[PDB]
Structure 1
Amino acid sequence: GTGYDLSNSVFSPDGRNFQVEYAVKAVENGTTSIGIKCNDGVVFAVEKLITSKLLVPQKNVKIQVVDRHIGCVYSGLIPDGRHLVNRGREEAASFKKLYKTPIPIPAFADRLGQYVQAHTLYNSVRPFGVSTIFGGVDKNGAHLYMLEPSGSYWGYKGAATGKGRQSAKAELEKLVDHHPEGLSAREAVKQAAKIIYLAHEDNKEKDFELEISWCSLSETNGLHKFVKGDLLQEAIDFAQKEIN
């Protein structure tokens, strides 16, 4: 019959969970965000739609840090993203308390995965209305991950989600082909700014603000840091020159 899409934990006759699929629609509706894995780190970037002149520029920060070495960005219901990161931070602290070492990114990815998956197991909760892109540097290199509302996650060379994900993915695929030996952190930052600008043609009706962060062994000492000042402008200038 029908009614299979009204409760969270319910399997439809073709084996699907419609409430998770509806959560994806909330993500697809959201702002575009990306991640770029470089040869000793990762770069994150996001589009911030400027609704009005009244929004204070450079405030309303969207990218979040976990521990000291992990960056997270997400598209969809922003509060759900914060909730997820709060959990991530609790989870990373626990790991460090017991095992001393900072949480490895793969270990951290599964911690978010298991938590998000848990919210598809019962009808007394709703799934997360975000896809989260995250990663950083650990004992053995850089890692980039994307985590969907189902709890599904994989490692990526580059990742994109939100309104302009097709544009971003198309640009991400060109970089993977044309830089097979590996991209640098400096380059990836500039290249990320470009992709957010090219992806912004989907939300071209309104103005936007660019935000970038990065975690690199040589550029940031393996710590997550935001891109500000002269380096941020250099990336914006590069994107504007590439758009024309």
Structure 2
Amino acid sequence: TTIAGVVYKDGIVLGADTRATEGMVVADKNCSKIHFISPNIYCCGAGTAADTDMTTQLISSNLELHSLSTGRLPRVVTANRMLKQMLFRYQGYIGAALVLGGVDVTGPHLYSIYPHGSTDKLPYVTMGSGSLAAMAVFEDKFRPDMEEEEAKNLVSEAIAAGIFNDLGSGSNIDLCVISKNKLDFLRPYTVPNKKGTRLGRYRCEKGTTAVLTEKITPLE
């Protein structure tokens, strides 16, 4: 698990990977780790998978309740206050590591949330198991107020450093670009890893398995 975010001169680029493991066995080769919050705010999830999923759906339901009652666009600082106040009440039992990012009237805002309830406003963050590898790419190559394709090149470089570290991915590098007006979301942005071809004949025969009892039930 390797997630990262950055703030360029106009918006926020998020990045993640596509592997969920159970033990030391790859359970999923294509998992979505970038979650919807609002039409300007997205959130990357890390930690316990079911804890991050059920948390990111509740707060996204409250902001849809909030903004439709209010009648205007939500704020990133509102989603910051809801998450750190909920997670503090569970005393860190819910294991959720989140990267919160969005563009408000006041501009872009990027946060990092720890499962005990501590939040940090930063221009660039990494979370997850391979966060140590992705952070070294940032500090070597971050400069303030980058352009669009310059910032997209930095994140896909930083995520790929964690992929070629352990607990990487069956790689489909994801990107979510949030700007002041345009919103992008790219699942197959980069496929660096391919599965090799199968060079053997595995001809399953029509009748090579003994059957004790058959049963037919039609439908309509």
Do they fold alike, i.e. is TM over 0.5? Answer: yes
Aligned residues with identical type, % of pairs: 21
Partner of 2:141: 175
How far, CA to CA, are the matches of 2:117 and 2:76 in structure 1? 16
Q: Kindly tell me: are residues 104 and 204 of structure 1, through their superposed partners in 2, closer, same or farther at Cα, counting changes over 3 Å?
A: closer
Select 1:65's aligned residue among 33, 36, 42.
Answer: 36
How far, CA to CA, are the matches of 2:94 and 2:130 in structure 1? 20
Q: Name the SS for the 2:164 alignment partner.
A: helix
Instruction: Tell me the CA shift for residue 54 of structure 1.
Output: 9.5
Counterpart contact for 1:105–1:138, Cα < 8 Å: yes
Indicate the larger mover: 31-40 or 201-210. Answer: 201-210
Counterpart contact for 1:47–1:211, Cα < 8 Å: yes
How far, CA to CA, are the matches of 2:100 and 2:62 in structure 1? 15
Partner of 1:82: 53
Partner of 1:19: none
Partner of 1:114: 85
Q: Kindly tell me: are residues 201 and 171 of structure 1, through their superposed partners in 2, closer, same or farther at Cα, counting changes over 3 Å?
A: same
Partner of 1:226: 185
Select 1:192's aligned residue among 152, 155, 161.
Answer: 155
Q: Name the SS for the 2:150 alignment partner.
A: helix
Q: How does 1:42-53 map to 2 (within 5 A)?
A: 42-49=12-19
Partner of 1:147: 113
Select 1:104's aligned residue among 75, 95, 113.
Answer: 75
Q: How does 1:193-212 map to 2 (within 5 A)?
A: 193-203=156-166, 207-212=170-175
Counterpart contact for 2:96–2:115, Cα < 8 Å: yes
Counterpart contact for 1:71–1:136, Cα < 8 Å: yes
Partner of 2:2: 32
Instruction: Tell me the CA shift for residue 140 of structure 1.
Output: 1.2
Counterpart contact for 1:163–1:202, Cα < 8 Å: no
Root mean square deviation, CA, Å: 2.5
Which one has the largest radius of gyration? 2
What TM-score results when the alignment is normalised by the length of structure 1? 0.69
Structure 2 gaps of 5+ residues are 193-220
How far, CA to CA, are the matches of 2:147 and 2:166 in structure 1? 29
Greater fraction strand: 2
Greater fraction helix: 1
Counterpart contact for 2:88–2:116, Cα < 8 Å: yes
Structure 1 gaps of 5+ residues are 1-30, 121-125, 238-244
Name the aligned partner's letter for residue 95 of structure 2: G
Partner of 2:99: 133
What TM-score results when the alignment is normalised by the length of structure 2? 0.76
Name the aligned partner's letter for residue 13 of structure 2: V
Q: Tell me how many residue pairs correspond in the alignment.
A: 189
How far, CA to CA, are the matches of 1:165 and 1:209 in structure 2? 17
Q: Kindly tell me: are residues 88 and 50 of structure 1, through their superposed partners in 2, closer, same or farther at Cα, counting changes over 3 Å?
A: closer
Q: Name the SS for the 2:116 alignment partner.
A: coil
Counterpart contact for 1:63–1:72, Cα < 8 Å: yes
Counterpart contact for 2:45–2:97, Cα < 8 Å: yes
How far, CA to CA, are the matches of 1:54 and 1:130 in structure 2? 20
Whether 2:129 is the aligned partner of 1:163: answer: yes
Name the aligned partner's letter for residue 79 of structure 2: F
